[PDB]
Amino acid sequence: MFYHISLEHEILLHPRYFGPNLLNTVKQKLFTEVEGTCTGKYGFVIAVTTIDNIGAGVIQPGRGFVLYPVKYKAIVFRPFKGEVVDAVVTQVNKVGLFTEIGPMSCFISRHSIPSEMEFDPNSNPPCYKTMDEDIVIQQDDEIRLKIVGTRVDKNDIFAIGSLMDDYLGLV
Amino acid sequence: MFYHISLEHEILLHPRYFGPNLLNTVKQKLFTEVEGTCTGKYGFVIAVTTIDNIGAGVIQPGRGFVLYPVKYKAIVFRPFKGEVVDAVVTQVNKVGLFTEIGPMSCFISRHSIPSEMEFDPNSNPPCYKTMDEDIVIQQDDEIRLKIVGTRVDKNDIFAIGSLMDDYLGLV
Amino acid sequence: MIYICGECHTENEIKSRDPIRCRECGYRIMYKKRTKRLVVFDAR
Amino acid sequence: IQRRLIKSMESVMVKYDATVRNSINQVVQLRYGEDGLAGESVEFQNLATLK
Amino acid sequence: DFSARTVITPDPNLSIDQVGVPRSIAANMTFAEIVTPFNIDRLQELVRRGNSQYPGAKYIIRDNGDRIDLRFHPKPSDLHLQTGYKVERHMCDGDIVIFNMSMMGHRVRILPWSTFRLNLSGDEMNLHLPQSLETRAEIQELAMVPRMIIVQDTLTAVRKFTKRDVFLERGEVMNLLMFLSTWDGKVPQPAILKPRPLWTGKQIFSLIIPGHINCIRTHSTHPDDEDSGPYKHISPGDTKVVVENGELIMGILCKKSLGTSAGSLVHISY
Amino acid sequence: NRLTFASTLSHLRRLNSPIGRDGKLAKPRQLHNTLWGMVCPAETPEGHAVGLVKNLALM
Amino acid sequence: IFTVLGIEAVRKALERELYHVISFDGSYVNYRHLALLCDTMTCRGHLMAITRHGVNGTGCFDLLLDAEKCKYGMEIP
Amino acid sequence: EEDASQLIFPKEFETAETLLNSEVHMLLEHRKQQNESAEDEQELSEVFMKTLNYTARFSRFKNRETIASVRSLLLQKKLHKFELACLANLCPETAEESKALIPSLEGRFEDEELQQILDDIQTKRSFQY
Amino acid sequence: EEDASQLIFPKEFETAETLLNSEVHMLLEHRKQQNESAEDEQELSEVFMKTLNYTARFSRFKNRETIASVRSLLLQKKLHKFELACLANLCPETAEESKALIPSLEGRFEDEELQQILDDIQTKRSFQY
Amino acid sequence: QKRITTPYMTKYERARVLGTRALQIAMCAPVMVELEGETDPLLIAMKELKARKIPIIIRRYLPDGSYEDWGVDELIISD
Amino acid sequence: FDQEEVFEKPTRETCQGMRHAIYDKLDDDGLIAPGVRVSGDDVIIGKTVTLPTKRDCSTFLRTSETGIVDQVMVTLNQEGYKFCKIRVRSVRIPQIGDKFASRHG
Amino acid sequence: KIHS
Ligand SMILES: [Zn+2]
Structure with missing residues (x-):
């Protein structure tokens, strides 16, 4: 069944993408990670409608990869x-x-x-x-x-x- | 560490052992199942001291194996x-x-x-x-x-x- | 194996991985004559 | 209708206290058929003390 | 072990509980049985038969739970079995099968032809075999056809059979009594001893009635005024059915008297 | 349907009742008087789709 | 009848209607079976529609082995 | 531990609003349009294509106006959101069909009022020819 | 989620009473004696043999009288059952050693009274020669 | 004692008791009654019920959670 | 391009995956000639796929009926690839299970 | 039917 949900996904961004307007890279990255996949809890994520907001990018110690908690609106197919x-x-x-x-x-x-x-x-x-x-x-x-x-x-x-x-x- | 405990173990008895004084077979069987083994929750069961009581033997439908819930006193080695x-x-x-x-x-x-x-x-x-x-x-x-x-x-x-x-x- | 054209009804030998066509007709449907291994029939 | 009726009464059964109860253990009838007798052994007859 | 569905045909010879099954279907179906010393030889011979022969076993299960296919038969020692093993011997005569939530059990009888045989008393069906002994024993004790409960080809003849006009010669009586399973073995005395013996249809049917059951019924063509008339006991048309000590003294049987109803010979006997 | 020649002839002359609102509102299954001489009354598949499928009259 | 006489009166009325249709063609059904259907529907105090799902067990007693009765017995072999 | 017949499912989906098969096709089309031309990216995933065919094949409505009208019509009633898309997607022919397919409707809908709702959906759904 | 230092462990073991290494050897010996001669059964498991050597090697007491005396002596105090066997099994030389090895004792035992308990255990434990 | 269930044995109890006993007999279980050549396990158990020798004890669970231990020998069977 | 279907005898050696059946019926071209009796599970046309050694994907009899192949046809489909059809003929004798119907009833 |  098709639903409209607001999900949370922690996006891992490489420092190579720290150039100007890096938020665009984060936005486009979200269209590949949660798009076309099938989470076992919410079902298939067939498509993403829009992005709600992008949280502050926290740098993980040691790893060096900035974590960006982003909220987006998407439609899932969860068979009840x-x-x-x-x-x-x-x-x-x-x-x-x-x-x-x-x-x-x-x-x-x-x-x-x-x-x-x-x-x-x-x-x-x-x-x-x-x-x-x-x-x-x-x-x-x-x-x-x-x-x-x-x-x-x-x-x-x-x-x-x-x-x-x-x-x-x-x- | 060594402790004195009263454990419960469901003994599976074959119908072949339904002869006279079948309780003796159940008693001796318990000296092989829980004796010399090592349960992950209570630790090694090094020895068994005595048997508290033997419960009523319930016949499992279909399987045909009588289940005997027996209470016994034993000493375990549980490393805290x-x-x-x-x-x-x-x-x-x-x-x-x-x-x-x-x-x-x-x-x-x-x-x-x-x-x-x-x-x-x-x-x-x-x-x-x-x-x-x-x-x-x-x-x-x-x-x-x-x-x-x-x-x-x-x-x-x-x-x-x-x-x-x-x-x-x-x- | 030996086949038979469905138009002229003439023998034409066709090998493996060979185009299926009659030389005398170009007809594209071929049949098999018969097997040399006979079977047993009982009148029942 | 046949399938629907069975589902709504599949769990209905007579317990050892001569009572009719479902899976939830709710008392549907105190006694089966209000008398506590099987429906197969009963035979039709006419008592002649009322006519 | 669901079987392949096949058409249904009637078989009056078979008992209502019994069911006819072809050899091919029974060959595919298997019944796991625990071997015992009292029947160790019986399983020993059946396993030796092999799957090519119909009375064989598809698989043999050891105590540890390993299943050995009998199609190959690699070693004679593996063929040999020990006590406590489970053998999936092919279905044979006397086995209990269940089919159409209330289902009626049946006793399988092997017949040569393919179509199933049922003693109705057409549509395809699939018969299910209970593998476990516990459910097999339970099925034969409560789910059998006798505990669950006549064709139209018999009721019509029954009415003619019980007619007073019908008279049976010694030769004819012999054949009828031969098929009677519940026969004491003694031929009843003829109703008309002279000039020649002639058994009435009721006399033959009297032995058919089991034990001593008494019931009174009326034929379909029973005039209402007949009961009120002086000939109520001696029915002018034999339209009154009375049975005493299990003997049909008078009356022509029909669906009303012999067919299932509130009061009938079958119902009273049950 | 090439099982029988008669079946092949019937299939070619086969007719289908309207579907959708038109068929739903009306009673295509029921036999009407207008079928006399135009659609065979006896011929109709047996089942749920009884009367929906018919055959053209011979003449 | 439910809103006027109550659920209890419906049980008898439901029985009469169920029996009336069943007996219209001359068929008869035991009263115990008919009463069971009405009681289940009215068991909760309000009329309940029969389960529309229509998708479609000897466990009230358990057999227990006794050692005292097993003291006697000889193995067949 | 969840069952659609009994209206039991994870609490997260409660906030979500259901979508129609035809309506989702429009959303997929909007997603498809931008990806195809607006930005130069990799081709859409096979999952996206598979659902697009499913929605198009089972699309019961032609344009947004028909979709909006049905959505507005069913919103006036006390229909649960789960039943909102399920009823429209299934398009039951009659009231009896819907209740058997949807056990929830039988709880709070009568045999007459619901029939007046399904037939309205029929007048909205558009046939090929 | 369990720690011996903080006296946290599964609730089941609370009912159990601890046993000394030397005392367990006696129980194992009783089990060994009956199996060896009383009944004709399979040889004792390797686990039983391994623990028998461990108890014998670390057995701090000769006979039951010494074991009983220490058990009775420590029972008079408020010593927890877990510490009852642990203290006797460890046989700390002085009070300072016991507290560091057994953090629980420091909670409710003073540096002087406990020293008077460990030295008593020393008078009971028997040396080879 | 204080048992309120019917003294008679139900058909369901009879079928299960014989079935379970018959399965046990097929698994090299001892037979209390004398054996007179009855090979089929069901027959062996059937006569055991007649002679009131089956060790099985029926524990009838009342709907309130209480249970009554009714012996097969104690129960009145129908022959 | 890498994998294609071919008609030939699925020999046990050249073929890795195969199903237990009699393959003597097939001829050198992988097609059973007319006049051969076929019973039970038997291969009547040989087809293999050269997976990236070949895997057997031949077609066996749909049922276990005993029949004799009547005629064999070899053609080229619309795509131009080799395509063949064979008609298996079997004789059914009326028995107790066959359903007979009058012209009415 | 049976051959199936
Ligand atoms: Zn040619």
Whole structure:
């Protein structure tokens, strides 16, 4: 889910960037450190809107690197547990549907999929279709799923979804 | 340091030991599980004096292993931080004196040793002796040291000592 | 392996990593004649 | 409806004190069915002391 | 151990609790069993069979928890097992399976063909096998079909069978009584001894009724005025069902009398 | 659908009910009188999408 | 009925409405099952909508081993 | 220990205001425009591109006026901020769908009033053709 | 977060009563005797052997009577249980040595009274020859 | 003593007691009753319940937190 | 540019990663000729990727049905790369599990 | 179905 937050990030600036208008270098540096990354607590930081303020630069003893606490406004994508949200299917395998909820990728297990659905390796391309053929989930298909749980791995958030709940599927 | 404690240990008993007087098997089993081991919280369990009581055996569902909570009286060796205690030297190296405080082994760093002391590789056997030769620490020498800190590793407690404090040495 | 053109139905030998085209036609679809290893058929 | 009803009564059970309680241990009914009898063994009959 | 779903077909011969399963599906499914001296030889032979033969074991688990695949069979010594081991022997006859939150357990019977067999009394299903013995014992004690509780092809024939018109010759009676599991072994005395023996349908059905259960029911085509008339006990149309000492003395059975309801032969017997 | 020749013919003449506000407000699933001679009444897929998909009449 | 007669009266009214629809087609359901549903909804003193989540255990007793009863017994082997 | 259905989550996100998928696309577009031309910097991260496609594909509104109208319309009610974006992003067809997908709404919204809100969103969301 | 000098340690050890190095040897000997002969079991763990040598080497008392006398003598005073074994195990020569080695004693013990206690321990500890 | 639970044994208790005992029997557990060739472990435990020899003691947890120790032999089973 | 797909027999030596299956069915060109019976898990077309030694990525039978390849087609796709299609023919005998339906009902 |  998308939110508007005010976060704090300590920026490490090399003394080489102590030239005129060094604040510009700090401002542009913040567009690379917290931009495009995925903090495990607040989720993916997709973009940064503006900068609130830049704190005083404290020089760390011994290290010689000035620390600049800067406050900025950014939008994060934090998947809350037990939240239903639309997703896009990127691939389908016997294990289960592989979905894509925005920047992150959510995996759907076969057990979580309703029993009526049955994987078909013959059909080109693969798509979980039930016997009645009423509902079929192809690749790049907009489907709604509920995230039972989320786990953080290697500075990334991996989500697990399910469709056992009512009104989860193509609609 | 040696203490007298009453600990709790859940004993896992196989159904094969459900024969007559099975309580004896539980009693003898406790003399192998908590005996000779080294818990990281209470230190080395050098010996067990007696058994207080044996609780009711609860059968774990599915597993089929009956769990017997048993209370026993035992003596532990827990090295408290910042505690001065006698030690026995087991080996001497350029890095520093290697001591032995009962069941565990405590290592003394060269820096912690007083500056007056100087390692002598020529002397057979090695022994940290100062220039004045007044005090010499040979192997198997009873010396007093203060444990600055202790760390738990692989179910064992490793202690670090020092002799900078007054009245630490051969006396 | 030996293939068959889908237009003239003539044998044309095509090797590995070779363009698929019939010399007599230029036709771009080729078929395989048959395998010399026969199978067992039971009337059931 | 079937799924909804089960979820709202999944934790409802009869305890050893002949009382109906949920996971939170709240008393739903003092006695199961207000009588404390199973619904399978009961048989239909008409007592003839009122008609 | 979820199995591959397959279509369902009926099988009157199988008991309602029993379920038919093909060899191929049972081969994939495995049931871990703890080996004991009383059945040490049974596991010794099954493991020797191998995975190529249907009565085999997919894996064998030692006391330390190591699993050895039986497909390769590298050493004969590894094949040998000790007491207390766990062997994932393939499903065989007599095992308990559970399928469609209330689920009914069933006893698996191996049949040659592929489709599942169920004694209904179509849609694909997947049968689940309880690996643990504790839950297997619990399932067979409370989740079985008898504790959970007739086809339309039998009720229609039952009404015709119990009709007073139906008369069974000695030859016909023999075949019917052969299929009767709850038979004392003694042929009942014919209702019409002369000029030739002729057992009525009710007499054969009387042995079908278990024990001594008494109940009174009415046929669907039972005139209301018949009960008030003098012929209430002797029904002109045999529309009144009465059972005494487990014997169907009179009346044509139907869904009202034999089918599940507030009062019925099946309900009273239960 | 090339499973059967009849299926192929039906698919080519297949019709779809309107979607969105127009379809939502109306009752495309229900069979109307105007279908007489224009859209086959009997032919309709079975399921939730019953009556939404139809087939053109022969003539 | 809740705002006029109270939650207690709703329990009977809810039973009647539930039984009325169930008995309309001739089907019958045991009163104990029907009463349980009404009691759960009104257990908190106010009408509660049935859990809309609709996503969908023998632990009230524990088996304990006794050494006294194990004094007798011979191993099968 | 957090669950969206029960409206439990870290206290930090309480101060944050939710954003719509279509609205975020505008913010991403503003970020994309300046980076592409305003300053000579490295190409945007793959994460930024991935979310841009997701927002564009699921964008339920054409222009800011439609987005603002829905935001203003839902702000008048007691809708929680978490439900503000979730309802608009999901676009439930009817009131029954929204409550099942959003358990929170059932707590303080009736079957009739909410239906009058979802249908309003339908009149705002624009279809391709 | 625990320090012996400041008398801070896990609350569990408070109930425990300290033991002397020589006294522990007796307990180990009792454990050793039964295992060796009373029951046929596996040989004692290497940890048990290692501590047995440590206690025997640093055993400051010959028999139980000497151990009991020192324990009773120190029990009459307000000596903390942690200091009870530590003082006896260390056997400080003079009062000044004990306080520096044991910071706790300096809090509630004077330079004169404690000296009268350490010298008593000296009269009890037995030398080889 | 002072036990207020029903003297009879519930079906759930019977199923679990036999199941747990049967699992124990399969793990080389001793059998109190005489063995007359019954190989299947469930049969061994079934007759043990009939003879009132199963060592298992049922601890019924009351909803208030109290527990009552009811022996299988003490409980009245239905045969 | 570095890695490309090719059609050839995935020999056990030249190929590092492979799946346990019978490879005698494939011909010198990596394509099974018409008339060969195929049953269970069997490779019917040989494809390998020259990862930066090659890794096997052949295609096996979708199911375990026993069938005989009917015809084999080798072509060039729109991109110009070699492209082939093969039709596996199997005979199904009606059995107890097959579903039969009348013209109505 | 079964072959799958
Ligand atoms: Zn040609």
